[PDB]
Symmetry: C3
Subunit: 149 residues, 3 copies
């Protein structure tokens, strides 16, 4: 039983030129790239991405920081929603565990490199927001017998 999560490299990941290193961390566990697209995020889409925070005082500055190039991604694997969050580490890099993306690359929450869905419901919503169904690619990894039980 696999699932799919939405992972997005934020503008700091693009500008620091660590896109490949980020992708390699997820590929290393045998997670499958199901979708990938470079875009420039707009306020219109970011308002919906961050809909839970409508009306909050930090939302304008958060949208501003995110208005830039991003890499939209979908990865598939067992428990991948929760596992991707564990791999990213805590929101605040200073609190994240060594070995996580945020602890290894970052200093502050406002520049923490990557977003990932926080739940099954959020993953479905975010994938549908950033990708049309025709952009989601279904194929089987050739090493499946050595990745899955």
């Amino acid at each position: 039983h696999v699932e799919q999560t939405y992972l997005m490299i934020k503008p700091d990941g693009i500008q620091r030129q660590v896109v490949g290193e980020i992708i390699s961390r997820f590929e290393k566990r045998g997670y499958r790239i199901a979708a990938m697209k470079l875009t420039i995020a707009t306020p219109a889409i970011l308002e919906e991405h961050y809909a839970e925070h409508k009306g909050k005082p930090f939302l304008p500055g958060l949208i501003e920081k995110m208005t830039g190039p991003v890499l939209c991604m979908v990865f598939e694997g067992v428990d991948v929603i929760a596992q991707a969050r564990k791999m990213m580490g805590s929101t605040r890099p200073g609190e994240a565990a060594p070995g996580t993306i945020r602890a290894d690359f970052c200093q502050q929450a406002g520049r923490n490199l990557i977003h990932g869905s926080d739940s099954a419901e959020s993953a479905k919503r975010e994938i549908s927001l950033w990708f049309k169904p025709e952009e989601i690619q279904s194929y089987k990894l050739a090493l499946s017998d050595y990745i899955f039980e």
Copy 2:
């Protein structure tokens, strides 16, 4: 002072072609390769290796997954039995700590890349099962003065 542990790269580690990366993680700590042999594990030797699980429902499928090429290894170092277990991480990759082999490479317990002895008693038994005493090589690391206090 130093101990020796039995570590075995499972068929998934061979087939995913991460043998060198695994070895490098142990070399990086100054652990000494005391023995190393590629073989193909067979049901008869695997039944001995997993003797504690004789008759349990999972054992046939476990033996099937393990019937394939494996890299038998003995590493030497301070506290290396417990330390190698810590470096492998939890049996279930989803529970293993960031930075461990199983967290960094794997998804499920049935394909968790590597075996390591769980105790001094098990290390003695496993080394005797998979190696002849004379495949264990005695030599000293030239960097010993900078590895050991």
Copy 3:
């Protein structure tokens, strides 16, 4: 918002030829190299470095192990004193978390690769002991807008 910490690669780090790997771990978080100097540590400077331990029975052996080439470093970043300690890991490599320098490279406390300041007061004192003010370089990282919130 940023502070500076004193980090010193010990003779084992020099002799095992992992200096670049150590530096890369700190650069990876966008920490700025403010000072760097190769020297050979001598007993008289080490007595001042370890002044808090005057009279303790372990001090002579400690000074002996530390007599050798060292790389003196100052890194700057948000919370970098505490964060560098977290990245080094526990004094004893066998207790340190996977993903930390000491867990990834070392076996014993007496050969644990690196020193880092333990507090704001120790950072100020150690920086002044090992570096003259003219050796501390002030410049801005070009990627600052993507490192700092």
